[PDB]
Amino acid sequence: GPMKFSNITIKNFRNFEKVNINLDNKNVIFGMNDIGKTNFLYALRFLLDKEIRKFGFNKSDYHKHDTSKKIEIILTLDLSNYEKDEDTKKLISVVKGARTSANADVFYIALESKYDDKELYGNIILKWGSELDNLIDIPGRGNINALDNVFKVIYINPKMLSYSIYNYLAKKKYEDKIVIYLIEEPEISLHRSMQIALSKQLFEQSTYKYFFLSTHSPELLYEMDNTRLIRVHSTEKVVCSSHMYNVEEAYGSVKKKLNKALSSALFAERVLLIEGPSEKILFEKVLDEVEPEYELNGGFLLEVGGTYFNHYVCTLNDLGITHIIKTDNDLKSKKGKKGVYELLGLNRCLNLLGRENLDEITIDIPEDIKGKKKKERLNERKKEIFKQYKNEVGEFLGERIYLSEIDLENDLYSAIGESMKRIFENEDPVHYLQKSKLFNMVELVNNLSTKDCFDVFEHEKFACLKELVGS
Amino acid sequence: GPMKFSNITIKNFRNFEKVNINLDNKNVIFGMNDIGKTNFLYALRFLLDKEIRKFGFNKSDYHKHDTSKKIEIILTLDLSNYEKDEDTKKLISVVKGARTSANADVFYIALESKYDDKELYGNIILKWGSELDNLIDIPGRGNINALDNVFKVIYINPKMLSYSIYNYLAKKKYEDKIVIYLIEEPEISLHRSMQIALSKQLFEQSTYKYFFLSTHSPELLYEMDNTRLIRVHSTEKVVCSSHMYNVEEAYGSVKKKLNKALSSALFAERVLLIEGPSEKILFEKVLDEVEPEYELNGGFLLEVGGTYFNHYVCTLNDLGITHIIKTDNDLKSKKGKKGVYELLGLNRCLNLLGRENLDEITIDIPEDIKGKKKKERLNERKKEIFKQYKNEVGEFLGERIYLSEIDLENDLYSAIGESMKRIFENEDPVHYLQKSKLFNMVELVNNLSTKDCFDVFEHEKFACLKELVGS
After folding, report:
1. How far is CA A140 from the centre of its chain?
2. Does A275 show up as a binding residue in the annotation?
3. Which of B251, B224, B205 is nearest to B213 (CA)?
4. How many CA atoms lie within 13 A of A459 on its CB side?
5. Which of B288, B425, B446 faces A335 most closely, judged by CB atoms?
């Protein structure tokens, strides 16, 4: 693989006590603690940009203003594909020596700084090379370091004209050096469509490579592909989590909706996954009637539709975001019917915990049986298979995965029984609600009372909302 | 009704040639031409804030730098409920005279300015009162005008602490004057959840009243209620459209999802309305395979689910946003079944054009007929009712409203027939796709080819995508 960033071990910086967060060329930093993201970007500027090193470090630049500690930010680089990667050649041409033949792939770039009290100016002492144990003397011919011929920081901070012309300027002038775009909040004066355009140029075109993107709007993350997403936790003590966000060719067709839905959820402290928009309407009504500040204390309703949760689960778990999923046990037929049914409702929850896909179970449904009787038989079979796999359901509850008894609507009817009958005035309100999920769900929500909302919220079969709200 | 702003007739300003856009206390300005929104906010500052009047007008402050023309911005106020509206008392206590007894409700506040060439300083000559024809001499005791005791502009431009403490400061200090918050892009350094919080305090709490909000992120418009949404058109010649955005008590329950979906669509030049997420997946795949820049040249996929389009149609039409709707003719039963069916697929399209709701039509479906035969009978009835109302369908095509022959999936099968059979390998792929819309639609999209996408795009039954793409 081409040359890629690997890790940065920021220690005793303005806010970073001791963090070793992985990197990979295309980087995205977001989340809480805007000062944390700003400090991370300025740490990269200190490690790579000469325009920031010359000012040195101050008393405030250290962690808790404690001048005793030493700033040590160590960028880690991975080198491979020497004969075809131009940037690898750019990095290894300037470095003369200090590269042990044992490990020609790894390359450290550290930055040691100790504060002196006789002058109140912490000197930036670059010490880069290939091994942490042994460092040779850096040339440092005056103000320009040897690193200055390799890594030049192009700082973008607000105007689409500048973004459009930086491509031309770098292509025609900065070919020799490696460009590292440290973009900090480019959504300041860009429209939603402008944010989409900038995301398309960033995450798809090769003109922006090795870029560190700071964003606060989900629109800038609509085209994420093989990047490294970095999320800063909400605590004042900065904790950052990293995840390779790459879409498989299986999800390539649905990549647009996948990214559009996941980008908004990336900024939520707690994310709840749902299948259909009727579930969205019901959960939104319940939350508005019990806790309208769910979006405020950290919450989201991620509508995934079909596909699988595997990509969503990996992305949400790697960033450390609270993981909540409520799903419906659905038995879908495939190829020849009448005895062929998959277990997507359960096959998903198995795939989230790994294991293996269940075989296509066979249900003996007579041909003459149809309509209400067929649905009753399917519900009985779903109840039987749910009662059979009690251990798997227990593991899902232990791993914050919620699976319905048969379907979501049956759980809703169990939580509130008389309210459904009063609203729909039918002997079988569940069947009527399944007849047209959207319109009937809207009608149910419009006539849904606060007491009914509280009953739904406090029921154990709807514990997803309780987990989303939190303490 | 309480005192409310009514209109501002900005003439010959920095970019506004001649515009008379309505106002109402809670105002939102967004869209293209960020300079246009900035000029509008500075026009309000000139008309109300003394901190901007003292600098006067410059050569650049006029339209096309033509000093011959005269700046004339005329704010229009509506006065009512005198005995209970404190702000009405605040406005009418300072004004002594100049209020004709014939019209005590309307109140103009103009601002005339002519450029002199002997000093190169356009004097701001305030002329306010109650009638355009006759104006009495304004007191103007020095630097502070008589208006300065009524309207004080609180300019907010980046930090949630300032927003939190402006409430306290205005409540404890600015009780006597009328506060007019001219908020310009508060999303500069606010998170998505912070934007939601600010929107909640703005559009719900009474502490922010008479505020002019400029936004570029849809997250700030998640709580819109009885405000006046102002959209600037994309042309360099500024055109602004206004609309009262108020939710009826019928839509109050679904208000959260309504606003969440509509806020994003508000920033799109062209908006296409869809019902289900499977439609979203299909349209996204087709667009990505024919025109990935649909989000760039102006486009959106508004998922409305159930409810009605009436609120959406009114909002999108009033702002002047291109209106595109693709819908499915669905016959939903109500109360006692077997002969009772509504025409939501057609009742909607009728309600969008006004008229009256069709009566609940009766379909003679025998009880023994079920499953495939019942669906076939329903499709035949839908085809018959579509062929019956050719004139209504022609009007919908004339008004950019697209109604399916029977359903969307049937139109998709008509557009591409062999591709569906190849992908699903079933004698009736449409029935299988309706069996589980989400998963089967995902499977179809994953195996959908570029030639099939082009065929779907160029077919007349999918003209919604062609209209969304445009020339």
Report:
1. 40
2. yes
3. B224
4. 19
5. B425
